[PDB]
UniProtKB/Swiss-Prot annotation, chain A:
Motif (Nudix box): 38-59
Quaternary structure and partners: Monomer.
Tissues where the protein occurs: High expression levels detected in thymus, liver, spleen, kidney, testis and large intestine, with lower levels detected in brain, heart, lung and stomach (at protein level). Expressed in kidney, liver and small intestine.
Disulfide bonds: none
Subcellular location: Cytoplasm; Nucleus; Nucleus membrane; Cytoplasmic vesicle, Secretory vesicle, Acrosome
Cofactor: Mg(2+)
Phenotype on disruption: Mutant mice appear normal, but have higher incidence of tumors in lung, liver and stomach.
Positions of transmembrane segments: none
Binding site for Mg(2+) 2: E53, E56
GO cellular component annotations of the record: acrosomal vesicle; cytoplasm; cytosol; mitochondrial matrix; mitochondrion; nuclear membrane; nucleus
Protein name: Oxidized purine nucleoside triphosphate hydrolase
Pfam family, one: NUDIX
Organism of this sequence: Mus musculus
Length: 155, 153
């Protein structure tokens, strides 16, 4: 009997010359920059989950999200398949605001600090920045080392 | 670091039947499947899919519809198999047995799932309902799935 896939959301506010990231202040991935998101709850849609996490973590509200990717992840030593649903936003309401969990900061699109993002980001950001959609899977040894991956555009 | 190896799979899916091939040798011998194989350097995925369909079944098509993307791994290897799945409806020629595949039509309510790869039981319903999908399956061995993700795109 099977180990369950667990669902997560990730939102990247991607405007014409900049992307909003947040420095994670505690918990899983603390000390790296990332988009906003977290676990999708039982009883909520993925997109409602994404909007909720963007609001709680950054203080931003959105009318529209655009779904851009689906990437699953696994780590050696864990039975859990992490199933991450990735969205973009452009127009937003509110001002980026520091939360308990995240400190938002804008980055120019040619000045993304990839050394301080999850390692996978370096592989799929190019598709994200080109407004493409994609599916993939990454197998990690640990927080720093990818063992293998699959990634391709969907169209 | 491994990158995944690319494969194609083509299901000739008509209103009340689907064409499968019994694999005669190699990896998956003795199971029914669609037609396909390794995508080669220097050909597109879709051209690879047409190529394998022709080589294995003698059928040629004009149009393939992209249906799904599924990655696969087996416990105890970093190798990832990356399968791009396509449908076809109209085909030219006569399904003929090759060295690799024995083609047969199945009515859609009579697909022999026990003799397909185990994952097919999970994604065939999406295929049948014309839904596009992405997924990943981790296999303990050729009969046993440990873990999977599968979602409409
Ligand atoms: N960019 C990126 N890459 C990731 N790579 C996976 C090896 C961890 C995971 C995540 C992510 C997304 C949503 C929620 C959570 Cl907790 C995380 Cl960690 N983000
Ligand atoms: N239906 C299905 N399911 C699969 N499940 C993976 C555990 C093996 C693999 C395949 C497949 C597709 C193209 C080429 C080859 Cl060699 C194979 Cl084996 N097909």
């Amino acid at each position: 009997h099977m180990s369950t896939s667990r669902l997560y959301t990730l939102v990247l506010v991607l405007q014409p010359q900049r992307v909003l990231l947040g420095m994670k202040k505690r918990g899983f991935g603390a000390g790296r920059w990332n988009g906003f998101g977290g676990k999708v709850q039982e009883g909520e849609t993925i997109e409602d989950g994404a909007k909720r996490e963007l609001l709680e973590e950054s203080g931003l509200s959105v009318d529209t999200l655009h779904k851009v990717g689906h990437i699953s992840f696994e780590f050696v030593g864990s039975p859990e398949l992490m199933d991450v649903h990735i969205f973009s936003a452009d127009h937003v309401h509110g001002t980026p605001t520091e939360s308990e969990e995240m400190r938002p900061q804008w980055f120019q699109l040619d000045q993304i600090p990839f050394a301080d993002l999850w390692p996978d980001d370096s592989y799929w950001f190019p598709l994200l920045l080109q407004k493409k959609k994609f599916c993939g899977h990454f197998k990690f040894q640990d927080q720093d080392t990818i063992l293998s991956y699959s990634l391709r555009e969907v169209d």
